[PDB]
Amino acid sequence: NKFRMSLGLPVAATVNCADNTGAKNLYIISVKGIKGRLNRLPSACVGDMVMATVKKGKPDLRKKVMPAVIVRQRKPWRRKDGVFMYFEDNAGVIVNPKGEMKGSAITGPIGKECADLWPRIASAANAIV
């Protein structure tokens, strides 16, 4: 499966919504598959599927939790190649529980270990890198 990479997005984080659904801004509230430990805030990385509400966006998307997938994070992370790769902005995309891209396209690069892990965000991405 996927390897382990630096966790960068705690809860209450606020990420760009990099797709053509209309939402401008996701808001991380909780992460799939995470088991906690006293006081430890759940954290997301590239490829982790989170729950997120929209705080600034289309009126008909707001006020409801929705599965997102993080595609870009600014915290560095060490590849299994040696290189510490990262991005310029925190950003994720809406998905449905079965991992489908709700929208149609993703604006900009997406994490390589995000596209390879989600079979549809890979096709909706324009440039994997």
Partner 1 sequence: SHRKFEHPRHGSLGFLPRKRCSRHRGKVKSFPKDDQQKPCHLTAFLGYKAGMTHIVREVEKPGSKLHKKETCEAVTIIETPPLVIVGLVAYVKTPRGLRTLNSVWAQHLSEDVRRRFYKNWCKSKKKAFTKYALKYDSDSGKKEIQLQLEKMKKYATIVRVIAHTQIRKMKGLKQKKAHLMEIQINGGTIADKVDYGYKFFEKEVPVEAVFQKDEMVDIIGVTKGKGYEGVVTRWGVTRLPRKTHRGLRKVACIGAWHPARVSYTVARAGQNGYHHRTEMNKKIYKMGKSGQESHEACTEFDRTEKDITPMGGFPHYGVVKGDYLMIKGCCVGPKKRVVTLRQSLLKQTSRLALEEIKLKFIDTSSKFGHGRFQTTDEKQKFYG
Partner 2 sequence: LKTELCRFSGQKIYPGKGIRFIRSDSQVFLFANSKCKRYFHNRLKPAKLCWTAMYRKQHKK
Partner RNA sequence: GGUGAACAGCCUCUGGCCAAUGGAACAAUGUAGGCAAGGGAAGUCGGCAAAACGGAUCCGUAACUUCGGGAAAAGGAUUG
Partner RNA sequence: UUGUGGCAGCCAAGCGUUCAUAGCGACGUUGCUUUUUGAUCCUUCGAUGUCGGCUCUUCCUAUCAUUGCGAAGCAGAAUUCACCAAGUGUUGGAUUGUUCACCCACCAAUAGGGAACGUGAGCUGGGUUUAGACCGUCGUGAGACAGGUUAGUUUUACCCUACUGAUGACAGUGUCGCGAUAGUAAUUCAACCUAGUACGAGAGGAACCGUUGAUUCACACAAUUGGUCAUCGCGCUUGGUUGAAAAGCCAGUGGCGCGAAGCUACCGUGUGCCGGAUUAUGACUGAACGCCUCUAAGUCAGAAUCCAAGCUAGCAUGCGACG
Binding residues for Mg(2+) are: 39
**Least spacing, CB of residue 120 vs RNA, in Å:** 15
Contact 19, 105 (CB under 8 A): yes
Residue 47 or 109 with smaller CB distance to partner 2: 109
When asked if residue 63 is in the footprint of RNA (CB under 7 A), the reply is no
Residue 58 or 78 with smaller CB distance to RNA: 78
How far is residue 48's CA from residue 62's CA, in Å, rounded to a whole number?
22
* Contact letters for partner 2, residues 71-90 (x by CB under 8 A): -x---x----xxxxxxxxx-
Report 35-54 residues binding RNA (CB under 7 A).
35-43, 51
Q: What is the DSSP annotation of 27-68?
A: EEEEETT----TTPPPEE-TT-EEEEEESSS-TTT-SS-EEE
Residue 22: other Cβ atoms inside 10 A: 14
Residue 65 or 83 with smaller CB distance to partner 1: 83
Residue 78: other Cβ atoms inside 10 A: 13
Token code pair at residue 4: 């382990």
Instruction: Single out the segment in contact with Mg ion by CB under 5 A; choices: 19-27, 33-41, 86-94, 119-127.
Output: 33-41
* Strand, coil or helix: 106: strand
Sites of contact with partner 2 (CB under 8 A):
72, 76, 81-89, 108-109, 126-127, 129
